[PDB]
Design a protein around this ligand. Structure first.
Ligand SMILES: [Mg+2]
Lengths: 1091, 269
DNA sequence: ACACACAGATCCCCGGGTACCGAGCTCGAATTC
DNA sequence: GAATTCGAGCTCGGTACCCGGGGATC
């Protein structure tokens, strides 16, 4: 008797049987094709070694672990098992509306019911107990609520002191277009009058307000967009969670808790196991004030993690391909599923779902026993549904609190959910951590594809590694080789058909591959420990962990800023509309001069600039005014600041009349970060890492705030403050620029200010002069100083500025001292920090659309420009002329060994060895071939050359390794053979055959193909070389390429097919046939014959 | 500068700007083989070969000390060391000068310009001086010596010769000499003749050297009409080389300097 | 009976395309013999 | 009492601007 129906398959007797007829081995070849797509009435069976049982079976024994004490409503955990847990953990907060009639039979006492009687919000605190047992705690006492001005609704709505307004609002819900809002009694809308000042426009004087209490979220988004637009009806968007979090001082959305008995002894209330609302081993429901935090208990009590990864066969009826979820012929064949533990990082179970008999290689079983990992459990299956249900019943049975994988939100979960929702028709609204009707969906948009499962924090790793590491290959195997360097055997899905039809050994070879892939992912997760960093942010901001993963960056800052305004008796509007949301200048002296700089470029980046500005200058919404009448009674120069951002002439008062919400917010957080970083050496190493996660969360959430305000048309945008923040940013960058030019533009004034500069003098002349500046960074170019002691003096320069001009919360910071630098663009440059490190800021030196040769020779080129001195100084001298003057003046000699690289990267492509195979130029074969509007692509040329010449094409989501050959002499005719076989039943120097018509395939090119094509390869090489090294020549791509192309010795021989004719005509030679002397006499002989 | 200096002062630069003047953008995508005894600028037009030797006497001061250096004309494939030499490109030219510094495998050319403006002051543009490296290995091929037959021609005569024979491919274009001092150039349809004479030591007497020798030669590809009318050749002289196993015939521009095209023939039937 | 929800996708380099510009070179009615 | 050019207009090869779809891994 579950209260809420469970919408997972506790049992299924029938399914839609889809399985390759490759499965049978008595099915002679005609009956050995396609997928046997159909139907069967038998409970889905999983075979484990010798054994067999229903997939969907609890039983005494199982084939996978189980951590749910109900599964289908019959209790499973043993007779007693009442793990009293005062100190529970909370890893995730769900908020959902629990209509108190809909939780009639939950068998509470009457407190939690009384609270929420027609409808209310219940914030359920999913966590885990040090005893082990997963657990969930329901906090019932939260209301969303919101404010509207006092007269602006009394008069406008013409309805008196708030209960009358309350009824008006319920009338607006019920006297409405549709049945969405049902049976609203006013008393569901208890209101009050309040005084909160307006967060905006401080001369908006503290107003009298109406604060109407609204039980449910859905009623709030209707009262926020379906109630009169001509009052901005303050604070209606607010979640139930953030009201729960803020309103109760000290709480967190992640971290240990305590059940406190008080206030007439209302302890948290234990849940009857037939009233559980989740997959938890014990549950309780407890008003917000039956609850309490503790600190100093930082440890995650044995949470689990499923590192699953799927492999699918894409056979359709022909054209083995990428699968596609909408095709019942395209189907998953195996699923690896690696159930780790989170506290001890101990891989605990290795499951492997397999369609068919599957024999893991005896090497693999030995390998997994040798690295001490448990014995993989290969489950045989008969149908794709059997597998997908078995996997999904693991995700519910095990209930991995954390789920990881590579691309699981991009491909794996989208595939499995798409198979399970339209082909097999499975409700996924119960397979998360709430049994009935949670959220298990996946918003498509594209790769920021959002997956929301409730109580399963789907930490994908593609989305985590894409942030953490900054390679750009991002295929799992390359990623593991790059972070983990583990020496994996890689498989292709051109052996998925070969290995899946060969037999159980080879299907196990596929199984081995999927287990290796998921072990790689598990190793990734437990190296990066994403859950700790997200959990830090989730308990810092006020939001649940899932929310920090998926939704925005502004909800963090918004919820904390909401705590501030709640203490400071403020209101906060609901922007005049998110009219719907869908799922599925001062700077020109301060910009790049685009040059090379060997002089040590101190970098004075301001330290969290925009928060320091926001907190220095008291910028907020509540410090702003717009008429100087609003600062009529406050002196200028002490009590305020008149800043004119676009002309608006805004007036941010200083602190001693009104404190800035944003200043106090950033101030408190920057103090916590300082304290924690002052706590690192006196902790144990695992706890130095834990505090590192904590301080990282503070840093991220504090740099967010400028984006919070500035970003237009979101949650509390105030473009005036962002405009000032950026405006003051530019004006302190300029104030720094002017001050630096002013005091310290004469070395002796520097040395009179900082005595340690005596020894820091360099031979040449002296200057501190900004050369670049952007956002929080100015790059002073301390010409005439040494690098060595510099950052020690930069830090004192930063201090001296930060206190001499700027207000106290501002700090400059000499982070770096680039001993060499190359200012490419407004955001591009390649420096070399003092201690020696090649910092490259966003010119992506490796281009995967260029081949391996090109990236390796171009990056060799850059590291020649930098690491080689006596080259780098010549690339320095390159910026003491106008770029064009370097066309007529030879380059400075130090660059010689620069050209000696390009002349190699040319020679290397025309040398005898005629490949080193990877010249790939991969295709990124945009999705669907035969619909490439432009046609005539290189990769399409090979696509149809394969479709004539020994094709093997996993066509649809796959790239082609493709080489360009040097207009081999027959290939014109072969492209015309294309120009009839492209058409697929539908002498005169033939125009310099288009490059994409010379795209011959690598394998065929190697086997016989010779004398590879310089012009396209070397030209793209120079395109990258010019893209980087144009900054030497003022971004003059023309001049850059003209100079770089002047490095290549170019040869001139006549074509021998007319040298032959001339040699039959007896022409004399003048040249470099290595008759040297001859050249002079034969040239005299030209003039004797011709004049 | 370089050890090896070229300079054209206005007298000699007018004499060369006129050599490039009879009119072209042909020999802009060229090759210059420079050495002692001057610059040879070679190009291929419509397949066939064209030469323009620029003697060292034809410059004002020339000196090449060192082996030959071969420069592709088009510096970065857009400008040309001779794109200045056109008729009316910059009509203020007073002087141009070339210095090729460095050593025998790595000699690098710089070309400099000098215009005049009012009051006759001379201004070097620093944006129309070009610089081109040598070629590491070139191999250029050249004609030979005192020809096997030779005759003089004039703009009306040469017009008559080109228009007569030159009929497009599928038409074999046959030059021929007869006894009694006769020249004929005939094709499948048209047949124009000229008497060649001595005293070369109404429109059909020429005065030549090697006035005795006959031949019946045929050209195979049809370019004489079109190479010669692309260089805007205002007549000239024809010079036949028959010793080599395929004859080649070298039509020059008699008018003062030369752009000479040499032509390779069908094997005499 | 829940109403079910759902509450940001852009924009950069490489490769075709000849709108037209402009630059050459062969060209068809006024020139000079 | 006998024929020619450079003029418009065509093509001509460009040619170089200048104008049209990219990435995102499984
Ligand atoms: Mg995956």
């Amino acid at each position: 008797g579950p209260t809420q129906r469970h919408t997972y398959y506790s049992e299924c007797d029938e399914f839609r049987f889809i399985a390759p007829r490759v499965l049978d081995e008595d099915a002679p070849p005609e009956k050995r094709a396609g997928v046997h797509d159909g139907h069967l009435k038998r409970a889905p069976k999983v075979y484990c070694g010798g054994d067999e049982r229903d997939v969907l079976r609890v039983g005494s024994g199982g084939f996978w672990p189980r951590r749910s004490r109900l599964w289908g409503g019959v209790d499973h955990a043993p007779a007693g098992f009442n793990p009293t847990v005062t100190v529970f953990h909370v890893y995730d907060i769900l908020e959902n509306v629990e209509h108190a009639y809909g939780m009639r039979a939950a068998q509470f006492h009457a407190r939690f019911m009384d609270a929420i009687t027609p409808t209310g919000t219940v914030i359920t605190l999913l966590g885990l107990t040090p005893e082990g047992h997963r657990v969930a705690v329901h906090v019932y006492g939260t209301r969303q609520y919101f404010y509207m001005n006092k007269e602006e609704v009394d008069r406008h709505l013409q309805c008196r002191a708030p209960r009358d307004l309350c009824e008006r609002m319920a009338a607006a819900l019920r006297e409405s277009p549709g049945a969405s809002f049902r049976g609203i009694s006013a008393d569901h809308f208890e209101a009050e009058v309040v005084e909160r000042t307006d967060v905006y426009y401080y001369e908006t004087r503290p107003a009298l307000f109406y604060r109407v209490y609204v039980r449910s979220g859905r009623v709030l988004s209707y009262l926020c967009d379906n109630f009169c637009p001509a009052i901005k009806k303050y604070e209606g968007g607010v979640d139930a969670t953030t009201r729960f979090i803020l309103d109760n001082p000290g709480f967190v959305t992640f971290g240990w808790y305590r059940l406190k008995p008080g206030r007439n002894n209302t302890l948290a209330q234990p849940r009857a196991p037939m009233a559980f609302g989740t997959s938890s081993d014990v549950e309780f429901n407890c008003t917000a004030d039956n609850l309490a935090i503790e600190g100093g208990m930082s440890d995650l009590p044995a949470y689990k993690l499923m590192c699953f990864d799927i492999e699918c066969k894409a056979g359709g009826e022909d054209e083995l391909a990428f699968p596609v979820a909408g095709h019942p012929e395209d189907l998953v064949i195996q699923i690896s599923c690696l159930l780790y533990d989170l506290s001890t990082t101990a891989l605990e179970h290795v499951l492997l779902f397999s369609l068919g008999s599957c024999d893991l290689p005896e090497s693999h079983l030995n390998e997994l026993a040798a690295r001490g990992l448990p014995t993989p459990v290969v489950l045989e299956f008969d149908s794709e549904f059997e597998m997908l249900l078995a996997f999904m019943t693991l995700v519910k049975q095990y209930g991995p609190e954390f789920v990881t994988g590579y691309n699981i939100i991009n491909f794996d979960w989208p595939f499995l959910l798409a198979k399970l929702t339209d082909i097999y028709k499975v409700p996924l609204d119960g397979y998360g951590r709430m049994n009935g009707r949670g959220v298990f969906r996946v918003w498509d948009f594209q790769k920021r594809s959002k997956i929301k499962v409730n109580g399963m924090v789907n930490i994908d790793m593609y989305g985590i590694i894409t942030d953490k590491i900054k390679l750009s290959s991002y295929k799992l195997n390359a990623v593991a080789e790059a972070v983990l360097k583990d020496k994996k055997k890689d498989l292709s899905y051109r052996d998925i058909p070969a290995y899946y039809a060969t037999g159980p050994a080879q299907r196990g070879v596929i199984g081995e591959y999927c287990i290796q892939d998921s072990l790689l992912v598990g190793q990734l997760f437990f190296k990066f420990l994403p859950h700790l960093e997200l959990s830090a942010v989730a308990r810092l901001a006020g939001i649940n962990i899932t929310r920090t993963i998926y939704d925005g960056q502004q909800i963090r800052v918004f919820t904390c800023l909401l705590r501030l305004a709640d203490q400071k008796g403020f209101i906060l509007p609901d922007t005049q509309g998110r009219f719907r949301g869908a799922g599925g200048q001062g700077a020109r002296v301060l910009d790049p001069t685009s040059g090379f700089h060997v002089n040590p470029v101190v970098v004075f980046d301001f330290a969290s600039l925009y928060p320091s500005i926001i907190q220095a200058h008291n910028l907020c919404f509540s410090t702003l005014s717009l008429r100087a009448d609003a600062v009529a009674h406050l002196e200028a120069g002490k009590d305020y600041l008149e800043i004119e951002v676009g002309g608006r002439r805004l007036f941010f008062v200083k602190a001693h009349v009104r404190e800035s919400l944003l200043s106090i917010l950033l101030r408190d957080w920057l103090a916590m970060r300082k304290q924690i970083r002052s706590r690192i050496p006196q902790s144990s190493p695992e706890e130095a890492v834990l505090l590192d996660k904590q301080q990282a969360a503070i840093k991220v959430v504090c740099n967010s705030v400028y984006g919070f305000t500035g970003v237009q048309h979101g949650l509390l945008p105030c473009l005036h403050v962002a405009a000032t923040v950026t405006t003051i940013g530019r004006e302190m960058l300029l104030a720094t620029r002017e001050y630096v030019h002013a005091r310290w533009a004469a070395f002796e004034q520097l040395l009179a200010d900082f005595p340690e500069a005596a020894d820091m003098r360099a031979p040449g002349p002296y200057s501190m002069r900004i050369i670049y500046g952007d956002t929080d960074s100015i790059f002073v170019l301390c010409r005439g100083l040494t690098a060595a002691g510099l950052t020690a003096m930069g830090d004192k320069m930063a201090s001296h500025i930060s206190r001499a001009l700027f207000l106290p919360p501002i700090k400059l910071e000499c982070e770096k001292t680039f001993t060499k630098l190359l200012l490419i663009a407004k955001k591009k440059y390649i420096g070399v920090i003092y201690g020696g490190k090649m910092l490259i800021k966003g010119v992506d030196l490796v281009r995967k659309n260029n081949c391996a040769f090109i990236n390796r020779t171009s990056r060799a080129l850059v590291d020649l420009l930098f690491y080689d001195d006596t080259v780098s100084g010549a690339a320095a001298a390159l910026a003491e002329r106008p770029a064009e003057e370097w066309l007529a003046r030879p380059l400075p000699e130090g660059l010689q060994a620069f050209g000696a690289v390009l002349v190699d990267a040319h020679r290397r492509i025309t040398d005898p060895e005629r490949d080193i195979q990877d010249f790939v130029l991969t295709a990124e074969l945009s999705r669907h071939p035969r619909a490439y509007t432009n046609k005539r692509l290189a990769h399409l040329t090979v696509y149809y050359k394969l479709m004539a010449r020994r094709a093997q094409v996993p066509s649809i989501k796959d790239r082609i390794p493709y080489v360009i050959v040097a207009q081999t002499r027959e290939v014109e005719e072969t492209v015309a053979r294309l120009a009839a076989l492209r058409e697929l039943d539908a002498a005169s120097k033939p125009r310099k055959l288009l490059v994409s018509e010379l795209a011959e395939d690598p394998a065929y090119a190697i086997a016989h193909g010779v004398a590879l094509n310089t012009d396209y390869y070397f030209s793209h090489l120079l395109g990258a070389a010019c893209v980087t090294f144009k900054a030497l020549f003022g971004n003059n791509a023309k001049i850059t390429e003209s100079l770089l192309k002047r490095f290549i010795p170019e040869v001139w021989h006549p074509p021998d097919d007319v040298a032959a004719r001339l040699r039959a005509a007896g022409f004399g030679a003048v040249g470099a046939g290595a008759t040297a002397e001859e050249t002079r006499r034969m040239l005299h002989r030209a003039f004797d014959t011709l004049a | 500068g370089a050890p090896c200096q070229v300079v054209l002062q206005g007298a000699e630069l007018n004499g060369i700007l006129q050599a490039f003047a009879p009119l072209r953008t042909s020999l802009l995508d060229s090759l210059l083989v420079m050495g002692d005894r001057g610059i040879l600028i070679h190009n291929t037009i419509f397949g066939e070969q064209v030469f323009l030797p620029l003697e060292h006497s034809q410059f004002s001061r020339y000196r090449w000390r060192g082996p030959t250096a071969a420069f592709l004309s088009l510096v970065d494939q857009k400008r040309s060391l001779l794109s200045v030499f056109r008729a009316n490109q910059y009509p203020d030219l007073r002087r141009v000068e070339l210095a090729i510094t460095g050593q025998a495998p790595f000699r690098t050319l710089v070309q400099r310009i000098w215009t005049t403006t009012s009051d006759g002051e001379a201004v070097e543009l620093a944006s129309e001086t070009l610089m081109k490296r040598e070629l590491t290995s070139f191999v250029v091929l050249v004609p030979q010596g005192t020809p096997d037959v030779q005759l003089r021609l004039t703009r009306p005569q040469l017009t008559k010769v080109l228009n007569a024979t030159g009929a497009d491919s599928a038409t074999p274009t046959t030059f021929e000499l007869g006894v009694n001092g006769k020249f004929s150039v005939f094709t499948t349809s048209t047949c124009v003749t000229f008497a060649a004479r001595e005293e070369g030591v109404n429109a059909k007497t020429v005065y030549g050297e090697n006035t005795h020798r006959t031949f019946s030669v045929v050209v195979d590809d049809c370019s004489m009409r079109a190479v010669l009318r692309r260089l805007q050749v205002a007549g000239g002289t024809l010079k036949f080389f028959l010793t080599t196993p395929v004859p080649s015939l070298c039509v020059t521009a008699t008018g003062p300097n030369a752009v000479s095209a040499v032509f390779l023939l069908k094997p005499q039937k």
